[PDB]
A paper describes a structure:
The crystal structure of cytosolic LmTXN was determined at 1.8 Å resolution. The crystal belongs to the space group C2221 and contains one protein molecule (residues 2–145), five Mg2+ ions and 66 water molecules per asymmetric unit. Accordingly, all the secondary structural elements as well as the overall fold displayed by the TXN family members are conserved, apart from the N-terminus. LmTXN was crystallized with one macromolecule per asymmetric unit, but in the crystal extensive contacts exist between two adjacent monomers, indicating a possible dimeric assembly with potential biological relevance. Mg2+148 and Mg2+149 are placed at the interface between the two-fold symmetry related monomers stabilizing the dimers with a number of electrostatic interactions involving several water molecules, the oxygen atoms of Asn93 (O-Mg2+ = 3.3 Å) and His7 (Mg2+-O = 2.7 Å). LmTXN displays an unusual N-terminal α-helix which allows the formation of a stable domain-swapped dimer. Solution experiment indicate that a monomer-dimer equilibrium is present allowing discrete dimer formation under physiological protein concentrations. The active site motif Trp-Cys-Pro-Pro-Cys shows the same conformation and interactions described for other TXNs. In particular, Cys40 is solvent exposed while the buried Cys43 participates in a hydrogen bond network comprising the highly conserved residues Tyr34, Ser36, Trp39, Thr47 and Tyr80. Interestingly, the refined S-S distance is 2.66 Å, intermediate between an oxidized (2.0–2.1 Å) and a reduced disulfide bridge (higher than 3.0 Å).
Leishmania reduces the hydrogen peroxide produced by macrophages during the infection by means of the [name]/[name] peroxidase couple. Two enzymes, i.e., [name] (TXN), a thiol disulfide oxidoreductase, and [name] peroxidase (TXNPx), a 2-Cys peroxiredoxin (Prx), exert a concerted trypanothione peroxidase activity analogous to that of mammalian glutathione peroxidase alone. The two enzymes are potentially suitable drug targets since they are both necessary for parasite survival and absent in the human host. In this paper we report the X-ray structures of cytosolic TXN and TXNPx from [name].
Author numbering:
A (entry chain A), B (entry chain A): 2 to 145
Write the structure that this text describes.
Amino acid sequence: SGVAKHLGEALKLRKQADTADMDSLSGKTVFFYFSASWCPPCRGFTPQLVEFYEKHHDSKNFEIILASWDEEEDDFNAYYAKMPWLSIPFANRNIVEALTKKYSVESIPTLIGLNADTGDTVTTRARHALTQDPMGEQFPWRDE
Amino acid sequence: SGVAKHLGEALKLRKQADTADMDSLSGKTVFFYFSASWCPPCRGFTPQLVEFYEKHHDSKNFEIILASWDEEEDDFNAYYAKMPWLSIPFANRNIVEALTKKYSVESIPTLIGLNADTGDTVTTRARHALTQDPMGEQFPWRDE
Ligand SMILES: [Mg+2]
Ligand SMILES: [Mg+2]
Ligand SMILES: [Mg+2]
Ligand SMILES: [Mg+2]
Ligand SMILES: [Mg+2]
Ligand SMILES: [Mg+2]
Ligand SMILES: [Mg+2]
Ligand SMILES: [Mg+2]
Ligand SMILES: [Mg+2]
Ligand SMILES: [Mg+2]
């Protein structure tokens, strides 16, 4: 795991125009958000997730990282511009493909929540959970 | 660290023509080898490291990962073709840049050894140590 940790920490995540380090994730719940500019149900969900994040990410101590299924860089940028959170850089498609496989992401939009420190999965149903609990009263929607 | 571990594990390392996963690193000493096709002292050291690896990587339980300072992809491939070990993919320049910063790699060839499981640094002087101990009798050349 140690080597993997160093390689992971060597990845710079996008933060809008900037790129950032990973310490900022310490002690938070972190979500990977699998979505694409071209996906119609994503287009309906992303605005709700944006609103939920702006309102609750501080108080509920979470971060979101876009894991984009856009393969065109201009579409990737147009879409990420609408988001207030972080992204795996467009160039790191390999990483998105691997995470997609890891979490059995068979459709989008999908939101996978995990403990930043342990790496343990917290929730795989947060896309559907959030639509039913827009206030986040049952956040982080733990599986089972 | 958990998020970083998942991102690291999502990176596929090059293994010659193939790309491989990271479990294969379990319980080994792992070295990052910082070098470039264009570097004259690298050209003199790489053949010795190749010979040392072929002879000892199994019995001394270690792996090597190229962290290339080549910025041209054809030169990167020509050079890596001479190596029997693994590489960070050419496309993952960002990662090489970060690891270079992390381990204060100010010149090449440089060999940085670490425990694969803990991630802890074992040796930062292995380039010079190996030339003086070609049999690896003092492997892994622990610092201080
Ligand atoms: Mg690092
Ligand atoms: Mg914030
Ligand atoms: Mg980008
Ligand atoms: Mg990648
Ligand atoms: Mg979901
Ligand atoms: Mg992974
Ligand atoms: Mg071998
Ligand atoms: Mg490559
Ligand atoms: Mg990279
Ligand atoms: Mg060295």
